[PDB]
Structure 1
Amino acid sequence: TPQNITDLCAEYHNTQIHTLNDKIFSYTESLAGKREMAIITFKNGATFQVEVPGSQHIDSQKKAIERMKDTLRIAYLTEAKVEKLCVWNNKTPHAIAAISMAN
């Protein structure tokens, strides 16, 4: 069980930590078919997706995907500092696996 986002990120292939230390600049969400996704940007231009859920996801996985989009929305609206994102960087835009907030 990892104790921090970096270690967690390290357990997957084709991941990377972005250290933003900045609030979210823009928040985009879509309910359109095959594109039920969220997209966030930062003032420096970095863009990240929360990928659409699939049939391959069990309920508790689907609740994590939804939770993440919830977290992103509420972080945006409270202007919470995003410390780090763990992303998958073999996708475009980079696909969020995890988030950390601090300060």
Structure 2
Amino acid sequence: TPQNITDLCAEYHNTQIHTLNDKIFSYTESLAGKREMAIITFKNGATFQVEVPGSQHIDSQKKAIERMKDTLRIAYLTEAKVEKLCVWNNKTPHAIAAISMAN
């Protein structure tokens, strides 16, 4: 079991860490059919999604996907500093797997 987001990220194929140390610049959320997703951006232009739930996800991830959107929304609203994101780089925009907040 990983002690931190960097070690967690390294357990998966097609991932990478973004060290941001910044608050979220924008938060977008959609209820449109087949685009039930969230998108965040940072002031450096970096854009990330929480993917629409689909066949690439196992059942245990469904509640976690919903939690992640909750976490991004409140991080944005409170101007919480995001330390790092672990993301899948075989999606465009890159898809969030994990987040760490510090500072």
Aligned to 1:50: 50
Whole-Å separation in 1 of the counterparts to 2:26 and 2:13: 28
What SS does the corresponding residue of 2:61 show, helix, strand or coil?
Answer: helix
Deviations 1:48-101 (A, max 9, x none): 000001266555421100000000000000000000000001110000000000
Q: Which residue of 2 aligns with 1:18?
A: 18
1:39 maps to 2:39 = yes
Inter-partner Cα distance in structure 2 for 1:58 and 1:39 = 21
CA distance in structure 2 between the aligned counterparts of 1:79 and 1:61, rounded to whole angstroms: 26
User: Structure 1 residue 22: deviation in Å?
Assistant: 0.2
State the Cα RMSD in Å.
1.2
Q: Percent identity?
A: 100
Q: Which runs of 5+ in 1 are unaligned?
A: none
C-alpha distance in 1 between matches for 2:4 and 2:34: 32
* Cα separation, partners in 2 of 1:41 and 1:56, compared to 1, 3 Å: closer
Shift of 1:20: 0.4
TM-score w.r.t. length of structure 2 = 0.95
1:15-43 per-position Cα deviation (integer Å, ceiling 9, x unaligned):
00000000000000011111101000000
**What is the DSSP-based 3-state SS (H/G/I as helix, E as strand, rest coil) of the residue aligned with 1:36?**
coil
Aligned length, in residue pairs: 103
Q: Give the Cα–Cα distance (whole angstroms) in 1 for the partners of residues 72 and 50 of structure 2.
A: 9
